Amino acid sequence: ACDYTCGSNCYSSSDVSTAQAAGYKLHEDGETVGSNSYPHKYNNYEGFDFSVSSPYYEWPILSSGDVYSGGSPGADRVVFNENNQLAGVITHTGASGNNFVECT
Numbered sequence: 668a669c670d671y672t673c674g675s676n677c678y679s680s681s682d683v684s685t686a687q688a689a690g691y692k693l694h695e696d697g698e699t700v701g702s703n704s705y706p707h708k709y710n711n712y713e714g715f716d717f718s719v720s721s722p723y724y725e726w727p728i729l730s731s732g733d734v735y736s737g738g739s740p741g742a743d744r745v746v747f748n749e750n751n752q753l754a755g756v757i758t759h760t761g762a763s764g765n766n767f768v769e770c771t
């Protein structure tokens with residue numbers, strides 16, 4: 668089993684660890700990367716009832732195992748907060764518009 672599933676994108680929690688971690692170091696340095704420049708705040712326009720406390724942050728997770736390093740965000744994503752606490756795994760895949768659904 669994969670700790671989180673976004674459609675067909677199965678991901679172990681370890682994977683999850685190395686994505687948010689990465690994205691949090693870039694958040695620390697205050698640096699931004701990407702056309703859609705990640706990391707950036709994720710406002711919760713969808714409103715999932717999260718354990719973690721806002722302010723939350725959008726950051727891409729690739730199914731290939733590597734970290735976001737510019738380019739393609741793909742469609743799945745990890746959201747941390749200011750104290751690197753994990754709020755979740757949301758994905759475009761399966762919802763409509765530019766929605767995100769939590770990854771089971």
Ligand SMILES: Nc1nc2c(ncn2[C@@H]2O[C@H](COP(=O)(O)O)[C@@H](OP(=O)(O)O)[C@H]2O)c(=O)[nH]1
Pocket residue numbers: 703707708709710711712713725765766767
């Ligand atoms: N679906 C969604 N997209 C978000 C959220 N927060 C940011 N984004 C996306 O990231 C883009 C870049 O981050 P931004 O929110 O800082 O601009 C946003 O432009 P928008 O603000 O117009 O939504 C939006 O398209 C959110 O809570 N939900």
